[PDB]
Amino acid sequence: QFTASRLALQNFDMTYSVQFGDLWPSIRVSLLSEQKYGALVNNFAAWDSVSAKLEQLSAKDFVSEAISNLRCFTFSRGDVSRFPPARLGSLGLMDYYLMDAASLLPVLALGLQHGDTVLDLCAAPGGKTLALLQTGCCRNLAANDLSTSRTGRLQKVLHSYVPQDIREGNQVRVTSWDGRKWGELEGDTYDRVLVDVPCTTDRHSLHEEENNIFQRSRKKERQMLPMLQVQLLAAGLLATKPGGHVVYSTCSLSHLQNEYVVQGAIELLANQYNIKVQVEDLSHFRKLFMDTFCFFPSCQVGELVIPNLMVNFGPMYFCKLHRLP
Amino acid sequence: GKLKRVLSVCPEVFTMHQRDIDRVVKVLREKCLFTAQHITDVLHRCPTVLQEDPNELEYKFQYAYFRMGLTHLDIVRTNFLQYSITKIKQRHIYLERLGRYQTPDKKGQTQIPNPSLRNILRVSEAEFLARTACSSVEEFQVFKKLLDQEEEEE
Amino acid sequence: TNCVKDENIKQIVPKVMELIRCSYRYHRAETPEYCIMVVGVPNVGKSSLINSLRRQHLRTGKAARVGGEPGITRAVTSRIQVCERPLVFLLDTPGVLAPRIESVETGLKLALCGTVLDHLVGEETMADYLLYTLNRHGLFGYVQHYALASACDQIEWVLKNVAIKLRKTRKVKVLTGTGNVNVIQPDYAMAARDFLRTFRSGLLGQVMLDRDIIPA
RNA sequence: AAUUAUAUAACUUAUCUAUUAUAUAGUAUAAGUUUGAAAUUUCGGUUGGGGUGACCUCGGAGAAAAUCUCCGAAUGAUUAUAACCUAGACUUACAAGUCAAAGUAAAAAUAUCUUGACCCAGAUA
RNA sequence: CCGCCUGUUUACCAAAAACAUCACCUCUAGCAUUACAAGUAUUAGAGGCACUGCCUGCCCAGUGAUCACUUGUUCCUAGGGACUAUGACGGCAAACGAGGGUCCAACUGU
RNA sequence: GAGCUACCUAAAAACAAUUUUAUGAAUCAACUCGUCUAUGUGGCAAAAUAGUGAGAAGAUUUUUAGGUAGAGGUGAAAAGCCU
Ligand SMILES: Nc1nc2c(ncn2[C@@H]2O[C@H](COP(=O)(O)OP(=O)(O)NP(=O)(O)O)[C@@H](O)[C@H]2O)c(=O)[nH]1
Ligand SMILES: [Mg+2]
Ligand SMILES: [Mg+2]
Ligand SMILES: [Mg+2]
Ligand SMILES: [Mg+2]
Ligand SMILES: [Mg+2]
Ligand SMILES: [Mg+2]
Ligand SMILES: [Mg+2]
Ligand SMILES: [Mg+2]
Ligand SMILES: [Mg+2]
Ligand SMILES: [Mg+2]
Ligand SMILES: [Mg+2]
Ligand SMILES: [Mg+2]
Ligand SMILES: [Mg+2]
Ligand SMILES: [Mg+2]
Ligand SMILES: [Mg+2]
Numbered sequence A: 001q002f003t004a005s006r007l008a009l010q011n012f013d014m015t016y017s018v019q020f021g022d023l024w025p026s027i028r029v030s031l032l033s034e035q036k037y038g039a040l041v042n043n044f045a046a047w048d049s050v051s052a053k054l055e056q057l058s059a060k061d062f063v064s065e066a067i068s069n070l071r072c073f074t075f076s077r078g079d080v081s082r083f084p085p086a087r088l089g090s091l092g093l094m095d096y097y098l099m100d101a102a103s104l105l106p107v108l109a110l111g112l113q114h115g116d117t118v119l120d121l122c123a124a125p126g127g128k129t130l131a132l133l134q135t136g137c138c139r140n141l142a143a144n145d146l147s148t149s150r151t152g153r154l155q156k157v158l159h160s161y162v163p164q165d166i167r168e169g170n171q172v173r174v175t176s177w178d179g180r181k182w183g184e185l186e187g188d189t190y191d192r193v194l195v196d197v198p199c200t201t202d203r204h205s206l207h208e209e210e211n212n213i214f215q216r217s218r219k220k221e222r223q224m225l226p227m228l229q230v231q232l233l234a235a236g237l238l239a240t241k242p243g244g245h246v247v248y249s250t251c252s253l254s255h256l257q258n259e260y261v262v263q264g265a266i267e268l269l270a271n272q273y274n275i276k277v278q279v280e281d282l283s284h285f286r287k288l289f290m291d292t293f294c295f296f297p298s299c300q301v302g303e304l305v306i307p308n309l310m311v312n313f314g315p316m317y318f319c320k321l322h323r324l325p
Numbered sequence B: 001g002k003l004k005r006v007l008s009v010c011p012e013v014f015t016m017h018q019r020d021i022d023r024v025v026k027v028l029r030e031k032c033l034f035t036a037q038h039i040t041d042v043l044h045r046c047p048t049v050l051q052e053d054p055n056e057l058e059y060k061f062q063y064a065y066f067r068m069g070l071t072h073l074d075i076v077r078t079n080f081l082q083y084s085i086t087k088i089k090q091r092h093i094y095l096e097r098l099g100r101y102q103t104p105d106k107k108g109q110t111q112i113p114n115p116s117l118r119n120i121l122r123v124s125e126a127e128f129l130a131r132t133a134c135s136s137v138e139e140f141q142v143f144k145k146l147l148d149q150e151e152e153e154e
Numbered sequence C: 001t002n003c004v005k006d007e008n009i010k011q012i013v014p015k016v017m018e019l020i021r022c023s024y025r026y027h028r029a030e031t032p033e034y035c036i037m038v039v040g041v042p043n044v045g046k047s048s049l050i051n052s053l054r055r056q057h058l059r060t061g062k063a064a065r066v067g068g069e070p071g072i073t074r075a076v077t078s079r080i081q082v083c084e085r086p087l088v089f090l091l092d093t094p095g096v097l098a099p100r101i102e103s104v105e106t107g108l109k110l111a112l113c114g115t116v117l118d119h120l121v122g123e124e125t126m127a128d129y130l131l132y133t134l135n136r137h138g139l140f141g142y143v144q145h146y147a148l149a150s151a152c153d154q155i156e157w158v159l160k161n162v163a164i165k166l167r168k169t170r171k172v173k174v175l176t177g178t179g180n181v182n183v184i185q186p187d188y189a190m191a192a193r194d195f196l197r198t199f200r201s202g203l204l205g206q207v208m209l210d211r212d213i214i215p216a
Numbered sequence D: 001a002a003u004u005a006u007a008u009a010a011c012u013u014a015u016c017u018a019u020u021a022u023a024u025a026g027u028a029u030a031a032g033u034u035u036g037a038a039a040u041u042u043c044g045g046u047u048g049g050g051g052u053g054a055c056c057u058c059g060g061a062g063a064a065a066a067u068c069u070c071c072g073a074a075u076g077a078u079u080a081u082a083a084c085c086u087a088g089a090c091u092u093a094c095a096a097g098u099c100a101a102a103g104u105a106a107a108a109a110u111a112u113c114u115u116g117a118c119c120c121a122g123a124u125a
Numbered sequence E: 001c002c003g004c005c006u007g008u009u010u011a012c013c014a015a016a017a018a019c020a021u022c023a024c025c026u027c028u029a030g031c032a033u034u035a036c037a038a039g040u041a042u043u044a045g046a047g048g049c050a051c052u053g054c055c056u057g058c059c060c061a062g063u064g065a066u067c068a069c070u071u072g073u074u075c076c077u078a079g080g081g082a083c084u085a086u087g088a089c090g091g092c093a094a095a096c097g098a099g100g101g102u103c104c105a106a107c108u109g110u
Numbered sequence F: 001g002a003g004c005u006a007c008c009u010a011a012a013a014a015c016a017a018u019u020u021u022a023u024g025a026a027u028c029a030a031c032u033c034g035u036c037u038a039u040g041u042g043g044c045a046a047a048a049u050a051g052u053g054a055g056a057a058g059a060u061u062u063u064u065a066g067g068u069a070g071a072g073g074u075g076a077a078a079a080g081c082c083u
């Protein structure tokens, strides 16, 4: 009677062991040991206060160091130290958000520009959605999540981290509707459409026990995930204005669920709707964050930040798609 | 000769109170369930066992027996008790997650060849990492730190 | 493969592994246990193959009833574990021949090796076949084993010699012209069995019953 | 499985003797702890019947009020801190649950938005 | 085909492939005046298991070579001392059987 | 309540003929058992009859008196036996 985590571990061994070859051992200890958190400042009240204290702890912003307007603090290579819990600031806004450094990369790779309307088709609580608010280059951020409970969390996160003036009536907008239906609701509307599809959440499913995608009863859903992911990605691609950019991000490493999904979407969009979407090179990004990330350089489409005990930031897969017309 | 080595390693066998001597033996026989002859090997092969809190000693046996699959004879023949729990947990767990070790199921079957218990502990850290685990030294050092936190947060 | 002396039986599992890798598994793609199934005609060692692999890999012991005469294993049984590392199970099934064998000769050969109960053929239209092929193929070994005078190609003669050697006789009713009479006679039937049972035991030599059909 | 367990076994502190410089011995008993021979009691519900799963209370939407189709809650943040008293009613097997004039008192009207009985234990005054 | 064999059993639907069995194996016990036993480890008790021959797993510090290093284990503080001279598995043997399948001969009102 | 039955203690009995040998060997009576079929099924019988069978110098069978008692006894384990 294997538990949900047992099945998830069992299923991963047979598949991933072939995908990476001899890196599975390394990638396997990382998922079962612990995670590494990267703190993101709120940029609204303590833009300086939190930065000074964190530096005294020896934590350094990896984004700022790489450039050598998002700034997220992470510890040095191989340092296992933790971040003191976030606190409420003088202005009434939290000091910083603790998130997996990898989650920030998609946002950072989305090439945000000033005066750009941005859509989060499946806006998970905080995470990438909060980071987009941190950057000032937004006009009308939108967020959606098929489930209503998580959005309730999303509103609290925004409230505690975003001043009311910025999150005005039209500045942000939270609607709990289906994502695939979004293909019709809007069209050629949002310049940037960050689409993070619901995924297998490898790291989480191993540790997580409740609501695990690998439960036997939930078999129905697990098989159909690639189909649902394609539809959600298709909906976002239709919505993006001509010449717009979208990023497809996923938490897992299953090639069937990361590399084929984007290629699939391209073919379905190529044929049914007679549109062409061309991928954008991220190799320059690859070379920039070598110091504080561990990714295998064999991904045909997109990039994939595998975990590693030295770094542990992961697992993420972010692909950038530009709509040529 | 058995007394000679035992006395040298553990001079206080004669000087320890009857309480400590009896308690250690009772665990080995009443809880660990070592045969009469095996116990003598434990006393002679690893004299230091006589100075370990009975409960602490019992844990060490349990960890091997249940969470490693070693038989009673395997524990005795390999001088397993002489090692320290801290080192045992680090090396075994490291492999148990790398996928280079597996706990025999009910049937006693394992789908991978577990490396020799000598390889787990007897060899040096550099030998253990290079051959049994084929891993870099740094990653292990990082793992040791993480391991401790889990104990603290256990 | 030779089941009794575990010849070449190791190679089977790697080939099954490699062979499966090329194929698809669909519904069972997630199961980690590789279950394969053994079939064939009776008395080919089908049940023995279970045991030979059962021991060669798992080193456990016999698990399927191995018997000389056809029909020992009747129904499709449950799985029998064979290996642990690939975790390979085997399904054992009863021997099936055909609803209709092709030719009278193939059916005659198929009885030589012991695939079909000999009394369905009589054991007298089959002993003759041995002498033919044994002499034809040149394996003149029965003469030495049965201390026969010299090579021959007549069942009534060889079975006369074999019967005397084994000191076996019957009381058989013969029908003469003045009425039935019971006369002691040498066991032609018993010699045929023993002549068949020596051949099948391999002490009469190695044979290639299908010859000049394989070359072509 | 739950609750026990001077069955045996062990230790520990007393009690009672011996001794001894405080001390190691024992022990017609009491109090603990460990071990467990035993003892007592039980086997929720709904699901052609058997694996597993699941589901069992209340709230929101459809069918449209009988079973079916879907979402959520065992709160959450905001805050002006929202008093006492008392007509008439709603709802309702019981139980629990709703609304509220008048009067008085604080202040200088306002709480906005979206749930578990009894017993028995507590905490402070 | 199964069980080594003579034995044993579900008085009253099961006589057997079950049970016992010599042989083999593991565990426990260093001892007297009521069992074991008026005995003393070539003994006694508890329990497993066909025997014989044949086979192979474990395990058997490493490298120099009876010698030195590297290890290992401990302490004193990353340094300093102290110490370390063969198998658990299979494969098979005649004889016997009111055992369970099968064949032929003879025999017959089946 | 062990006059049945299970096991035990003490004191006693029985085993022809034939062949092997020097025996839990062989053929087969007495004796012990109960394989297969038929009859019987309120029957002669609350387990028998008639045939056919297994053992038959042994771990055999039988006789007498004693022992173990229900939270138990006995058990070459059938959860058998204990009127
Ligand atoms: N010489 C020899 N005999 C073999 C070999 N394999 C099996 N046998 C013999 O074949 C008989 C066993 O057949 P078995 O393994 O039961 O095969 P089966 O096909 O499953 N039997 P069935 O006829 O019931 O279908 C025995 O007589 C056994 O000695 C082999 O490799 N060599
Ligand atoms: Mg009421
Ligand atoms: Mg009023
Ligand atoms: Mg027998
Ligand atoms: Mg007999
Ligand atoms: Mg009966
Ligand atoms: Mg009887
Ligand atoms: Mg009988
Ligand atoms: Mg009977
Ligand atoms: Mg038996
Ligand atoms: Mg019989
Ligand atoms: Mg006939
Ligand atoms: Mg009596
Ligand atoms: Mg006589
Ligand atoms: Mg006799
Ligand atoms: Mg007889």
Ligand SMILES: [Mg+2]
Binding pocket: none
């Ligand atoms: Mg006889």
Ligand SMILES: [Mg+2]
Binding pocket: none
């Ligand atoms: Mg008896």
Ligand SMILES: [Mg+2]
Binding pocket: F077
């Ligand atoms: Mg039984």
Ligand SMILES: [Mg+2]
Binding pocket: none
């Ligand atoms: Mg009675």
